[PDB]
Amino acid sequence: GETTDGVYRVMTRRLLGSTQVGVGVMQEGVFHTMWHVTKGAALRSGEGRLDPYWGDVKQDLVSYCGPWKLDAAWDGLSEVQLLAVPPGERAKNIQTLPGIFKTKDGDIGAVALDYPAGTSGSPILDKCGRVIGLYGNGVVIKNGSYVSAITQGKRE
Amino acid sequence: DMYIERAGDITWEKDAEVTGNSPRLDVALDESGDFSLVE
Numbered sequence: 001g002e003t004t005d006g007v008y009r010v011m012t013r014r015l016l017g018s019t020q021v022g023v024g025v026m027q028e029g030v031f032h033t034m035w036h037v038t039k040g041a042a043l044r045s046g047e048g049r050l051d052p053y054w055g056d057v058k059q060d061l062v063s064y065c066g067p068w069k070l071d072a073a074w075d076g077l078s079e080v081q082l083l084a085v086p087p088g089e090r091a092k093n094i095q096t097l098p099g100i101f102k103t104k105d106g107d108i109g110a111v112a113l114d115y116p117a118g119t120s121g122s123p124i125l126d127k128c129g130r131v132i133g134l135y136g137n138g139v140v141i142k143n144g145s146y147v148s149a150i151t152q153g154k155r156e
Numbered sequence: 157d158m159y160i161e162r163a164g165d166i167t168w169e170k171d172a173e174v175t176g177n178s179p180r181l182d183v184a185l186d187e188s189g190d191f192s193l194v195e
């Protein structure tokens with residue numbers, strides 16, 4: 001079906017009404033989303049079918065129709081935009097300066113913007129419009145607010 | 157059964173709403189892909 005580059009809503013008719021479970025990025029004929037949104041299940045695009053190609057529960061990422069294409073990274077210095085696609089609401093760009101998730105295997109960028117669970121998979125972009133990662137996997141901080149990682153894959 | 161619907165272009169927008177702080181957190185990532193706070 002529709003293979004045009006852009007941001008897309010991931011919907012399901014299994015629950016009550018049409019429920020938005022997540023968001024994804026279409027780039028170079030490849031659909032990119034978080035693993036916890038689809039659980040690796042196939043996707044429909046009108047009458048066309050999208051089958052999974054690569055996935056990893058630890059990274060919490062999955063690609064459809066081909067290998068992971070998104071390879072831009074946060075420069076560790078500048079502000080970014082969360083192109084938030086919330087359930088039932090219009091796509092909206094929000095500008096923030098990312099924080100840091102310090103782990104035992106290195107530092108990861110983090111965005112402190114709180115959005116509904118169905119916003120998971122919304123892309124985070126740099127000043128050139130390049131996708132530097134996806135929003136939707138993070139933690140609940142000492143304040144109760146949500147802080148998501150800037151989750152990026154590896155382009156083989 | 158899941159399906160996709162277009163929601164827009166991936167473009168940087170000049171004069172977008174600027175919000176959100178930049179915290180530095182000590183975190184752990186487990187085998188199930190779940191992040192947790194290390195203290």
Ligand SMILES: Cc1cc(CO)c2cccc(NC(=O)CCC3CCNCC3)c2n1
Nearest residue numbers: 036060115116117120136137138146189190
């Ligand atoms: C508690 C909470 C609240 C909010 C909003 O306020 C969330 C928004 C987006 C996304 C979330 N989930 C996650 O960050 C975890 C996803 C997966 C779980 C199992 N597999 C590994 C990641 C939110 N979790």
